[PDB]
Structure formats: C-alpha cells, structure tokens
Amino acid sequence: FKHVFVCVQDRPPGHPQGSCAQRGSREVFQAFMEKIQTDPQLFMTTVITPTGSMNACMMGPVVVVYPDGVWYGQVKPEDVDEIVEKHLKGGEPVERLVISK
Amino acid sequence: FKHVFVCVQDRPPGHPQGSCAQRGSREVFQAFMEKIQTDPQLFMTTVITPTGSMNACMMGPVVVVYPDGVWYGQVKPEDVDEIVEKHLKGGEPVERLVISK
Numbered sequence: 755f756k757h758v759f760v761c762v763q764d765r766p767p768g769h770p771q772g773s774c775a776q777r778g779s780r781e782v783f784q785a786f787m788e789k790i791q792t793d794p795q796l797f798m799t800t801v802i803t804p805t806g807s808m809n810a811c812m813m814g815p816v817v818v819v820y821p822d823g824v825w826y827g828q829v830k831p832e833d834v835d836e837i838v839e840k841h842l843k844g845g846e847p848v849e850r851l852v853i854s855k
Numbered sequence: 856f857k858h859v860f861v862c863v864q865d866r867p868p869g870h871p872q873g874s875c876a877q878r879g880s881r882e883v884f885q886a887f888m889e890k891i892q893t894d895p896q897l898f899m900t901t902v903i904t905p906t907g908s909m910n911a912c913m914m915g916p917v918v919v920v921y922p923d924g925v926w927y928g929q930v931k932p933e934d935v936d937e938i939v940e941k942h943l944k945g946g947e948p949v950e951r952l953v954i955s956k
C-alpha cells in the first residue's frame with residue numbers, strides 16, 4: 755500500500771512563494787489519477803490524495819509518498835509515469851526528483 | 856517526525872456519504888494547527904496538512920498519521936489533545952478512534 759499526496763494549493767498572484775497549482779500541480783494530480791485507474795495493479799494498492807500546501811512551495815510541485823516518506827519536488831505531469839513505474843510499482847524512488855527522505 | 860493529514864473536504868448536501876467538513880473536520884484541522892504551533896516540542900517535528908477526501912467518508916472526520924499509517928475516524932475537535940499527547944508525543948495511537956493501521 756502506498757499513499758501519494760499531491761499539493762494542489764493555489765494562491766493569489768502576489769504570494770511570494772507562488773503555489774504548486776501555479777507550477778502545474780493540478781495536471782500532476784490529474785495524471786496520477788488517470789494512471790492509478792487505467793492501471794489495475796496501481797488501483798488496488800495506491801491512494802492519491804490532493805492537499806493544501808505542505809510548506810515546500812518554492813520546490814513545487816510537491817508530491818509525498820507514504821509510508822516511505824519520500825518527498826518529490828519540481829514534479830511535471832510528464833514525470834508521473836516514471837514515479838508510477840519505478841517507485842509505486844518497482845519500489846525505487848526517482849532520485850532526480852527527490853527533495854527529502 | 857510525524858505528518859498528520861486531516862480531511863477538510865466539503866460536499867453538497869445531496870452527496871450520500873456526506874463529508875468530513877460537514878462532520879466538523881475543519882475545526883479538527885484548526886485544533887491541530889493551534890496545538891502544533893504553540894507546543895515547542897511539536898513545532899519542529901510535526902506537519903499538519905489539510906486534504907481532500909481520503910475515501911473513508913462515512914467514518915469522518917478522518918485523520919491519518921504518517922509514517923505510522925494510523926487512520927482515525929470520528930475525530931472530534933475535543934479529541935485532538937488526546938491524539939497529540941498520547942500519539943504524536945507519546946507514540947501510542949488512541950485506540951478508541953483508530954479505524955486502521
């Protein structure tokens with residue numbers, strides 16, 4: 755079982771740190787949601803949850819995988835397949851995107 | 856380190872499962888936020904994140920603590936102090952409210 759949290763926080767334009775939504779995270783969330791179901795094996799063992807800010811805004815879009823405790827930053831919609839294949843199914847975090855373990 | 860996820864999803868009245876917000880969960884979230892920000896030993900080791908639905912809606916308010924993987928249901932604002940003291944500090948989940956580990 756893995757639980758994926760995607761920050762979908764939006765903020766007004768003046769917020770100095772911006773927001774994950776401004777950096778494309780709603781499309782990241784959408785991508786995870788489309789994979790996890792179009793994909794039987796993901797669907798049965800993975801939950802994808804949208805969140806408010808997880809306070810790492812300038813490194814966004816922020817995606818956290820539990821119980822592993824892997825924090826990703828700068829995630830693009832195009833990166834979701836790699837995260838799904840390598841990490842969620844293959845158990846290997848995508849090192850290039852990790853900001854914290 | 857503990858990461859507490861509080862569902863704050865709201866739903867229109869017709870939705871059959873209701874929602875955590877309609878069951879009081881915004882007050883649960885606010886209570887966790889006030890506690891962690893005024894407790895010098897939690898403020899540096901705990902994150903409180905508001906979420907959309909985590910698909911356990913009839914058991915709301917739903918609160919999930921990672922990396923432990925403890926799922927709470929039916930959490931009242933008045934229960935937040937017990938979770939903070941016994942679990943977030945003490946390391947013992949509040950058995951009475953657990954719906955999954």
Ligand code: FES
Nearest residue numbers: 761774807808811
């Ligand atoms: S806005 Fe996404 S981590 Fe703050």
Ligand code: FES
Nearest residue numbers: 862875908909912
């Ligand atoms: S509305 Fe909170 S778990 Fe679904």
